[PDB]
Amino acid sequence: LFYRLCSSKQNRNDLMNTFLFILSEGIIDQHSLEKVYNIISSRAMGHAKTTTVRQLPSDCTPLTVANQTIEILQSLIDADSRLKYFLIAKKLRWPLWHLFSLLDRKLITDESVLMDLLTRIL
Predict the structure, then answer these.
(1) What gap in Å lies between CA 33 and CA 66, rounded to an integer?
(2) Cα separation of 117 and 46, whole Å?
(3) Cα–Cα distance measured from residue 94 to residue 52, given in angstroms and rounded to the nearest whole number
(4) Contacts for 46 with CB less than 8 Å, ≥ 6 apart
(5) Which DSSP state fits 94?
(6) Residues 102-105: contacts with CB within 8 Å, 24+ apart?
(7) Which of 91, 81, 69, 68 is nearest to 17 (CA)?
(8) I want to staple 27 with a disulfide (CB 3.0 to 4.6 A). Which of 12, 66, 79, 92 is the partner?
(9) What remark does the entry add?
């Protein structure tokens, strides 16, 4: 579904931006994960922040969210051909550097699967 949506320029840009935002300020800690989840839920509802009361699922942890996000992003990069160009195109302005930040987080560096997928993307 995400690959199909990528055929649209606006949808592709928005989806990539949301992916990078999640991976940047989402996979830090449980509280940060909850904050980003509330932000995303409010965005889906129609506004930016609004109410900030949304309990996270019990089984949802930064590990699983990071795994799913990185898996989807790697699949998109492998399938689509114009996404890597978007990634390539203060250093946080360049989208690619966001992925670089992940190398400084214990949650990511401690997982073989996450490391493999991130290394494939890079």
Answers:
(1) 10
(2) 32
(3) 30
(4) none
(5) S
(6) 102/23, 102/27, 105/27, 105/28
(7) 69
(8) 66
(9) Present with 350 molecules/cell in log phase SD medium.
- Tell which residue, 37, 35, 94, has the closest CA to residue 68: 37
CA quadruple 28, 68, 44, 11: dihedral sign: positive
Q: Structure solved using which method?
A: cryo-EM
Report the C-alpha gap between 88 and 98 in whole angstroms: 11
- Extract long-range pairs of 12-16: CB within 8 Å, 24+ residues apart: 12/80, 12/82, 12/83, 12/86, 13/86, 16/83, 16/86, 16/87, 16/95
- Enter the resolution in angstroms: 2.8
Residue type, 59: D
